[PDB]
Amino acid sequence: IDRIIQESVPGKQITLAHVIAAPIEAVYECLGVDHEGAIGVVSLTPNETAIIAADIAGAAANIDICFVDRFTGSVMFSGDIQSVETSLEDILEYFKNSLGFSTVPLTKS
Amino acid sequence: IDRIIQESVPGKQITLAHVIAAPIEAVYECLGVDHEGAIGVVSLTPNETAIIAADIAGAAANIDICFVDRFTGSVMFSGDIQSVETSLEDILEYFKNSLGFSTVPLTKS
Amino acid sequence: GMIEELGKIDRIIQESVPGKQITLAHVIAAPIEAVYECLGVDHEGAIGVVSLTPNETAIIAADIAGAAANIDICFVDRFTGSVMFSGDIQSVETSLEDILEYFKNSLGFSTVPLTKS
Amino acid sequence: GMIEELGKIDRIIQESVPGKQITLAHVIAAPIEAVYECLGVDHEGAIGVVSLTPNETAIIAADIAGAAANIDICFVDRFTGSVMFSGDIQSVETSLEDILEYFKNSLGFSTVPLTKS
Amino acid sequence: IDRIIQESVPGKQITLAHVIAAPIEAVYECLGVDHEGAIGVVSLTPNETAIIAADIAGAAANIDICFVDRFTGSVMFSGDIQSVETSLEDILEYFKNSLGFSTVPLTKS
């Protein structure tokens, strides 16, 4: 079995840019939010970029930030489906173009 | 021994999609749940996808969500064996077909 | 940067996912008093210790252990992927064997042998 | 195990150590109200955000930032390797530039460019 | 830049088997122990093996376990220098021979 030294640094990636269009009651309940609208879910690396993603999403009409987590690199936000989708697009486009991030497709459930 | 720089990012994978058909008493007690029915257990990466899997499980079948853990990337839920298996199948199908995630088989004990 | 350039250190992206493995399935036949005290358990019998990946499989291993033999579960830890349980040596070994056989034969996970101290 | 054998998945030992890198040196010029609220800071000025490895270098970056320009440190986090600070846009950019130049030129760390939103 | 999927599992290794022969006061103070004797320090992977190492060390004459940490994979114990050294040797020999661990030399400060 070969052995190597791995110098570990964070990559630059959005691994999830997702809208739950019509969450079930239990999902609203676990976030502690109003049981209305869609939920956007973002996974980012490095984790500090959560605050940047939350700032992009929360600037848009109809978007309320549910939480910004710099410890896990996660953002969740609420809005109508169309607002949530375009804010996910704003995040993907900013991070791809400006920070050279690897990105995933916008996904929907 | 050589040295390489590793840019660490989360992968996109379900590593466990499991039903315990007839849990022992100690296992119901560790989850704090009613001592009836089957338990479904899911391991996901990136961890934020736990909320997506919980939403699919609750919409797929008459199950009770035990917890949704975005910190560990884990979901557990309860219901009759058929209901829990339906929920696991719907998670695995959606994550594979719609998210392009790596998946595992639906496993049973 | 300078360290990387002058060291000619290469760079790769690694997508991290958990593997599927039992890395420890161990019986302490006759624990010392301090080990029983650290688990907060009765100072009698053997202790079984299991290390699993991914960590959520701890609850599956605990269920098999308790169904396999007359053991008392000490803890089931889905945060660390760990299970510990207690009982007479033969019961603890039976439970460890049943965990290894299920994970190897039904799940196809990588498994270590049963080890004893 | 069966999954590994039939998938012909190879196995390597990786000795994990931290690298030496700034992965983020970023100014939010005009934060939204919710971002100021999440940091618990005055709702005025730009925010600077730094991601460092190894995480203990957060205190070094905070010291440079505060010495470089009239900024207010929001937090210094040696557990996550993170620094955030606030001030007028030109002060926040000066502090980020001074962090990048010190880490690149004095320490030889890998560094990203200064980024703006 | 190449990209690979890393299936992460714990290795089997003792990375540290160390005796501080005559700790300074501050080191005794940080462990909350009597300011006498040497300190043995063990780093193990997987972390659950801390309990096995603590059982081997604590069985020996003169050894008191300071702490056993299954969350970090760490053990610290106290005794006279010679007892601490032979207990570190007992741990290294058990884990190398029985569990096939990679091991380091016994080190001393």
Next chain:
Amino acid sequence: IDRIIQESVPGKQITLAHVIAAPIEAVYECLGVDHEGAIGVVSLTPNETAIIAADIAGAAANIDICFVDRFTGSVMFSGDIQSVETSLEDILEYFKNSLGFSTVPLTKS
């Protein structure tokens, strides 16, 4: 994209051995220390070696240990610039020459 199994173990490395010669007030305040003298900062792997580095630092020179963190693998200490530099030098020499660890230069700001 190919897949490999990575057996993860800690490496043996000091990644930071740093003196802040004249800290700003906010930095003394974040550590909760007297606003006088230099600060030494050490990053170690495996994390248990923090206690070994703290012991060497305290025995090397007239320094005050701020914290010894075996959870993060970190040590910080305070003293006059000469004392702090002596302590960092003794840590780097011992870890390189006696433990066979990878080290970094003694760095200054």
